[PDB]
């Protein structure tokens, strides 16, 4: 009544609200997803991490305050932003900005999962994931923002959202953790984004890399990336719930193995060579061989703890795994040949392996010295690093019959005459246009789905144009308007300019004109 009441202090905890979320949905004929999907099975599942909006913000703000305290106060007072080995500080221009677009696309993919979810609890869970991928976009941006302010070379840390468009390695980034997530079946994102991308590849990409950063003097990236991945537990768990629903329905389960193999191949095709290249060639101090990092995280732990355990319920080891293991061993060395040969198209400063690097490569990859090592040493003798040399190795490749092709599906470059990774060139003409494919899995994707794969490659856009004009047009210069952002060495002297590139006379060919 007006006098008597229980005055014990009480609140309302997040789980007390969460238990009513499932009742927030209501039935009406139009209440179904807007996106195309093959998957139509019952999917009324329960959230493993109960969260409501207020608690979501409380948790993430608490993570942020610790991170920005470390960055803006402690590490800045230590001068940590310029205590990074130059090779690694250059590597983070690429890792952080390329990861940024993966996070950004994951926002949109997570929204497709939100749209295709049928349970209120899962719609609630995917909104939290959508918000996290926005958080991660801003965290990756913040790393390059901090480097722009505190590291000895801000160029390319400060403008990759436009200067990335110049080069060929960016094209494959737009598929690997990007278009390959958001352009297709919405329920299937639980397989490609989550069962593969988050549960398999974010661990080496975001966690294992922090150890390489630390070895090379970078404590900014561990501070941020280790906080990024704290959100990933909720993302993997969201996706697992839907994989269970797919597995439990015979009609939806018949699509799962093909979707898992296509997702695994799509992501590993780029991730395996490119991150292995960035780790081993973009570091001074190496933590361990990339192929062992891949063995630990991809083949043994994700492969056994997720895929091998799900084998009890009919999920098959990806058929492309044998091809992928060959890539884990050699494909990043193949990629290094193309990355170093086409260095003017990038936005980072590269360093040829030094004498102790070369010993490490040969010890851990026997055969490296007689193949890759001899090539890099010849390029050095020809003047790779010297702006007065007039030498750029892409022209040298062509003069020796070592043509570079772009996979129409993955956009990964391929040099069949030098590659030791998985691949073989297939060139087809279709309706007046030539296409180069580089492996059995992507060739099938293109043969079945040509209207999904019409990506222009750099040779098609740049055909017949001189290299320095392409770089200038794409703003690939420092603030003086003349010195390249990209460099073939990491020293402070003898930086290359547009006129130094122009003296080489490098003009883009049509690699398929010969067919």
């Amino acid at each position: 009544d007006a006098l008597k009441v229980n005055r014990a202090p009480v609140g309302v905890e997040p789980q007390e609200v969460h238990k009513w979320l499932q009742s927030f949905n209501w039935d009406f004929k139009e209440n179904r997803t807007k996106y195309p999907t093959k998957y139509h099975m019952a999917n009324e599942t329960k959230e493993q991490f109960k969260v409501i909006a207020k608690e979501y913000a409380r948790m993430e703000a608490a993570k942020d305050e610790r991170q920005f305290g470390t960055l803006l106060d402690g590490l800045t007072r230590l001068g940590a932003g310029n205590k990074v080995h130059p090779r690694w500080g250059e590597t983070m221009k690429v890792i952080s900005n390329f990861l940024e677009v993966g996070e950004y696309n994951a926002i949109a993919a997570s929204a497709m999962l939100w749209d295709s979810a049928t349970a209120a609890e899962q719609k609630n869970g995917y909104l939290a994931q959508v918000l996290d991928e926005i958080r991660h976009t801003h965290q990756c941006a913040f790393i390059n923002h901090y480097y722009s302010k505190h590291y000895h070379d801000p160029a390319g840390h400060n403008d990759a959202r436009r200067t990335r468009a110049i080069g060929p390695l960016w094209k494959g980034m737009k598929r690997v953790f990007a278009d390959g997530f958001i352009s297709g079946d919405a329920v299937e994102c639980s397989v490609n984004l989550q069962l593969v991308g988050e549960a398999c590849f974010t661990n080496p990409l975001i966690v294992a890399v922090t150890e390489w950063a630390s070895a090379n003097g970078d404590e900014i990236t561990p501070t941020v990336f280790l906080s990024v991945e704290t959100d990933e537990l909720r993302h993997m768990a969201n996706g697992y719930q839907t994989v269970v629903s797919i597995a439990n329905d015979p009609a939806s389960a018949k699509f799962l193995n093909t979707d898992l193999n296509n997702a695994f191949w799509t992501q590993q095709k780029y991730f395996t060579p490119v991150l292995g290249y960035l780790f081993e060639y973009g570091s001074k101090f190496k933590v361990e061989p990339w192929v062992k990092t891949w063995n630990r995280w991809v083949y043994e732990d994700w492969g056994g703890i997720w895929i091998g355990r799900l084998g009890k319920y009919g999920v098959e080891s990806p058929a492309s795994l044998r091809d992928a293991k060959r890539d884990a061993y050699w494909a990043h060395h193949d990629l290094a040949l193309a990355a170093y040969a086409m260095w003017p198209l990038g936005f980072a400063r590269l360093a040829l392996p030094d004498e102790e690097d070369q010993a490490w490569f040969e010890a851990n990859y026997p055969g490296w010295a007689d193949h890759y090592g001899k090539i890099f040493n010849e390029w050095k003798k020809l003047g790779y690093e010297d702006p007065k040399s007039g030498f750029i190795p892409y022209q040298w490749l062509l003069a020796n019959g070592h043509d570079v092709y772009i996979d129409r599906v993955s956009q990964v470059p391929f040099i069949p005459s030098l590659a030791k990774g998985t691949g073989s060139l297939r060139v087809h003409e279709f309706n007046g246009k030539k296409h180069s494919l580089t492996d059995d899995w992507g060739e099938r994707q293109w043969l079945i789905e040509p209207e999904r794969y019409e990506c222009h490659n750099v040779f098609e856009q740049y055909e017949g144009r001189e290299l320095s004009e392409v770089i200038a047009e794409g703003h690939g210069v420092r603030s003086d308007g003349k010195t390249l952002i990209a460099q073939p060495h990491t020293r402070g002297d003898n930086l290359w300019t547009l006129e130094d590139i122009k003296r080489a006379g490098c003009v883009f060919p049509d690699p398929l004109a010969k067919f």
């Binding site: 807007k34 297939r426 279709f430 099938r444 043969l447 079945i448 055909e463 017949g464």
Partner: protein, 168 residues
């Protein structure tokens, strides 16, 4: 031979001059449909403007869309295609067409041509998106039936490619 610069070149400039001469919804609808049949999708008639057609298509879309708002009654913006057809009739016709398809090769050409003919601003956006999604559902399901069942040698024949090179 030699490509002009990416974002400003004589091909884009020449096409912008053509587009500026469009003055009615009927004329611009035939223009954009003819353009999309000639220059878009793997079944296009010509790759002569490959690195410029997507920007040019944007500019045609913009001209047609302004002509629609200048010239058409509001109700036509919601319920009709710029062909004059009823938008819901277009939806029903093409969903039935793709559900009647006998193979993934029949189904893919129906979906591709639906987009070539009815991409906004020809069809109202809401009707187009839900039709495109219904069509894509059917296409994905037929393509993902026995996806690995045909060897590559047989897929190359079914697609009808001219094999120019196979590395040993």
């Amino acid at each position: 031979a030699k490509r002009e610069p990416i974002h400003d070149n004589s091909i884009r400039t020449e096409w912008e001059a053509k587009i500026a001469k469009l003055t009615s919804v009927d004329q611009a609808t035939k223009f954009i449909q003819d353009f999309r049949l000639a220059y878009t999708s793997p079944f296009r008639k010509s790759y002569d403007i490959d690195v410029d057609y997507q920007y040019i298509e944007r500019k045609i879309e913009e001209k047609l869309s302004v002509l629609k708002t200048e010239k058409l009654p509001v109700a036509d913006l919601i319920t009709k295609a710029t062909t004059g057809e009823d938008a819901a009739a277009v939806e029903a016709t093409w969903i039935a067409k793709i559900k009647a398809a006998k193979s993934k090769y029949e189904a893919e050409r129906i979906h591709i041509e639906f987009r070539q003919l009815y991409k906004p601003p020809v069809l109202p956006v809401n009707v187009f998106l839900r039709t495109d999604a219904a069509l894509g559902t059917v296409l994905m399901e037929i393509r993902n039936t026995d996806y690995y069942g045909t060897p590559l040698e047989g897929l190359r024949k079914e697609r009808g490619v001219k094999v120019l090179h196979l590395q040993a």
